[PDB]
Amino acid sequence: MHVFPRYAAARPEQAAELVRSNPFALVVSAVDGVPVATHAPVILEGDAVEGGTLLGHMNRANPHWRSFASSPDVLVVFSGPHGYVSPTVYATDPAAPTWDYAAVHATGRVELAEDALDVVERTVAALEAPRDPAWTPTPASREYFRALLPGVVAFRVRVRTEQSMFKLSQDLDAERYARVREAFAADNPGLADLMDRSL
Amino acid sequence: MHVFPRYAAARPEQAAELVRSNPFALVVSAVDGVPVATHAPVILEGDAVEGGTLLGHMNRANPHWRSFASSPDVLVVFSGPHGYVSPTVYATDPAAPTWDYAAVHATGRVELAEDALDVVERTVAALEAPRDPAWTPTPASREYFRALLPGVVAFRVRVRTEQSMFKLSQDLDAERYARVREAFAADNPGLADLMDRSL
Numbered sequence: 001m002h003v004f005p006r007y008a009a010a011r012p013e014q015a016a017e018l019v020r021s022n023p024f025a026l027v028v029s030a031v032d033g034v035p036v037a038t039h040a041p042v043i044l045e046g047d048a049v050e051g052g053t054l055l056g057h058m059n060r061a062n063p064h065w066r067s068f069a070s071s072p073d074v075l076v077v078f079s080g081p082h083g084y085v086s087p088t089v090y091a092t093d094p095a096a097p098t099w100d101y102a103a104v105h106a107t108g109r110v111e112l113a114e115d116a117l118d119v120v121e122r123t124v125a126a127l128e129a130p131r132d133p134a135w136t137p138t139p140a141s142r143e144y145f146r147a148l149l150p151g152v153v154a155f156r157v158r159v160r161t162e163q164s165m166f167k168l169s170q171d172l173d174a175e176r177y178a179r180v181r182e183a184f185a186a187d188n189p190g191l192a193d194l195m196d197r198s199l
Numbered sequence: 200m201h202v203f204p205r206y207a208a209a210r211p212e213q214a215a216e217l218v219r220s221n222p223f224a225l226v227v228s229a230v231d232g233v234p235v236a237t238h239a240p241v242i243l244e245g246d247a248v249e250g251g252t253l254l255g256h257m258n259r260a261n262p263h264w265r266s267f268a269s270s271p272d273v274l275v276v277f278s279g280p281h282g283y284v285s286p287t288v289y290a291t292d293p294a295a296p297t298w299d300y301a302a303v304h305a306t307g308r309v310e311l312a313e314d315a316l317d318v319v320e321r322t323v324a325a326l327e328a329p330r331d332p333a334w335t336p337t338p339a340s341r342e343y344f345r346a347l348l349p350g351v352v353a354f355r356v357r358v359r360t361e362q363s364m365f366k367l368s369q370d371l372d373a374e375r376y377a378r379v380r381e382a383f384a385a386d387n388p389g390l391a392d393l394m395d396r397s398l
């Protein structure tokens with residue numbers, strides 16, 4: 001998780017946009033000295049990642065959460081769009097490939113969430129609200145949710161350290177940049193949209 | 200990283216297909232007790248993940264590799280296609296959302312690769328070969344590579360434990376499955392193709 005100056009966020013607001021737009025995160029902790037990772041929806045409470053709170057849930061029968069007891073520092077990785085950059089795109093004889101991407105890394109202490117229902121219900125609102133149509137939990141769904149609670153574990157993470165990666169070829173020259181962006185405009189509109197938000 | 204019986208790989212070959220098809224991985228280790236993660240290309244040497252070797256490189260100025268010295272067990276996460284599953288897709292009144300995805304998790308001891316040039320040159324071949332056109336390193340590119348070596352660190356991982364996730368709604372009934380697959384066929388062909396390789 002090293003970040004060059006050139007591939008940094010322009011406004012610290014950029015990290016939170018990425019977080020809110022890509023909630024299917026990776027929750028990582030040191031179970032017994034070895035990294036263990038769960039894929040889970042995690043949402044952001046607050047305006048900023050640093051000094052904000054993340055909220056997530058996983059399967060209770062997923063034993064990963066039982067090792068949150070010690071409350072070790074965890075890493076939550078949010079992954080935005082990404083894409084391979086082939087030298088055939090550059091069309092230059094001395095060249096080397098790379099991979100373009102955006103990511104937000106949040107490190108902090110995890111604790112177990114009191115109100116699992118709040119967490120899951122807020123996770124619903126977070127994901128369904130930009131979708132059209134927005135799924136709004138029916139009362140019977142809220143009752144269904146109530147019945148599913150014994151099978152979920154929710155958690156919180158107080159973000160102690162945030163770190164953002166916006167590796168969008170912006171160190172390239174004007175000519176090689178154009179080929180990269182136009183090549184991604186075709187096949188990877190999320191990535192190409194991001195190369196514009198970096199200018 | 201818990202896997203229900205229902206969302207498992209049908210043939211252990213399925214893990215390696217996913218690995219080879221999604222080499223932009225996440226390399227995770229316990230630096231000082233806290234997870235640290237780097238996004239890097241990692242390729243598979245061998246027919247199987249378990250008992251195979253992974254090979255990767257990162258930036259030398261990325262200090263993450265300096266903590267591979269102790270050679271702790273690392274986790275490499277390979278992420279295949281994924282997608283949110285909205286209850287509006289099910290069209291059923293008592294419902295709850297989820298996220299469908301495929302991933303391979305490889306845990307083993309990392310060591311520093313002697314032949315960084317082999318690693319990067321094999322990483323090139325791995326990525327460019329299915330692309331049309333395939334970028335084949337020009338001699339001057341191979342010379343360029345030679346000049347870039349002081350700026351890269353390559354590594355190896357002996358996979359001690361493999362674990363695969365193929366969460367593709369296959370526990371759904373026939374009617375709800377159809378809506379999910381057809382909804383992904385439209386917007387997420389990689390995911391929908393995978394729901395067929397699970398049958």
Ligand code: HEM
Pocket residue numbers: 038039040041057058059060062120121123124125127144145146148149151152201283295296297298
């Ligand atoms: C709003 C968007 C939601 C998403 C994207 C989502 C996604 C997921 C995912 C990916 C898992 C697997 C975690 C693991 O592997 O351990 C999971 C577990 C679980 N969550 Fe959710 N969930 C959402 C909302 C809810 C709601 C509203 C409830 C209501 C109680 C709920 C209850 C559960 C249950 C019972 C499980 C365990 C069963 C299973 O593995 O599916 N979730 N959820």
Ligand code: HEM
Pocket residue numbers: 002084096097098099237238239240256257258259261319320322323324326343344345347348350351
């Ligand atoms: C074949 C596909 C390749 C991909 C997808 C790729 C991708 C990447 C990525 C994502 C990084 C950043 C790692 C970090 O953040 O620490 C990196 C670092 C680096 N790799 Fe590669 N690489 C490839 C081939 C090569 C080759 C053939 C060389 C030849 C020596 C090379 C040399 C380097 C160098 C010098 C750096 C540091 C400069 C930088 O940050 O870009 N790579 N590579």
